[PDB]
């Protein structure tokens, strides 16, 4: 694909989220860089409206899978890069078991030389005592495989998966993701055979930063295709 050539090296990233959870309005802004050659992603996020009303880990999936390393033999199954530079829409429903639901719509696309992920998030039916509004989740993010399938009808891809968030008390908060991606342009895109992305993520803090923030290191690498 032509989009793919855009990802030949380190690409600078902008992320912008406008959120509303149970009425609590907040905004997140993130900056950094991605490298699809090595499947590597480094981002620093700041809650620009003050304290974040939800826990940072819950926003990880929402806050650029075009930066997944697709191995050479899988290059033809890389929807995400193929939709660039005009980009793609990534919509999700995230149901937190026994708790509220995020609904998200994002556009991931190049603006100038910068890959931008611009997100609207609405959160509803959250329990004030729950693990989310109650900030009961550990500051981390498990390794995880997410399965990608083609959606020929929508000319894109879809994915269902469960994210397991560790709770303080040693239990697990499940977050059921239903995901759909569709091209923003009307050019041709790569529709993949079934495969999955292998994710590892490291959450940390900038010791110099006073604002409520997350430093995120991510590796994502496609797999599951025979040869």
Numbering used by the authors: 3 to 65, 69 to 232
Extract from the study:
Notably, methods such as RESOLFT (REversible Saturable OpticaL Fluorescence Transitions), nonlinear SIM (Structured Illumination Microscopy)5 or pcSOFI (photochromic Stochastic Optical Fluctuation Imaging)6 exploit reversibly switchable fluorescent proteins (RSFPs) that are able to repeatedly toggle between a fluorescent (‘on’) and a non-fluorescent (‘off’) state. In so-called “negative switching” green RSFPs, the on-to-off transition competes with fluorescence emission upon illumination by cyan light (~490 nm), while the off-to-on transition promptly responds to illumination by violet light (~405 nm). However, the development of RESOLFT nanoscopy in live cells necessitates RSFPs that switch efficiently even at low illumination power (to minimise photo-damage), display minimal residual fluorescence in the off state (to maximise contrast), and are highly resistant against switching fatigue (to sustain a large number of successive on-off switching cycles). It was found that variants engineered from fluorescent proteins of hydrozoan origin (jellyfishes), and notably from the well-known EGFP, could fulfil these requirements, giving rise to rsEGFP15 and rsEGFP216. To shed light on the switching mechanisms of rsFolder and rsEGFP2, we solved their crystallographic structures in both the on and off states.
The four point mutations that allowed evolving EGFP into rsEGFP2 (T65A, Q69L, V163S, A206K)16 were thus engineered in Superfolder-GFP, yielding a new PTFP that we named rsFolder. The on-to-off switching was triggered by illumination of crystals with a fibre-coupled 488-nm laser. Models were refined at 1.45 Å (on state) and 1.50 Å (off state) resolution for rsEGFP2, and at 1.50 Å (on state) and 2.35 Å (off state) resolution for rsFolder, respectively. The experimental Fourier difference maps provide evidence that in both RSFPs, off-switching indeed results from cis-trans isomerisation of the chromophore. However, a drastically different scenario is seen in rsFolder, where Tyr146 is replaced by a hydrophobic phenylalanine, one of the mutations inherited from Superfolder-GFP. Consequently, the switching pattern exhibited by rsFolder is unique. In the on state, the phenolate oxygen of the cis chromophore is H-bonded to Thr204, a water molecule and His149. Upon isomerisation the interactions with the two first partners are lost, while His149 and the phenolate oxygen remain H-bonded, resulting in a trans conformation of the chromophore that is a mirror image of the cis conformation. This highly unusual mechanism results in the off-state chromophore of rsFolder remaining tightly attached to the barrel scaffold and likely explains its exceptional thermal stability. First, the thermal stability of its off state (~64 hours) is 15 times higher than that of rsEGFP2 and, to our knowledge, unprecedented amidst RSFPs.
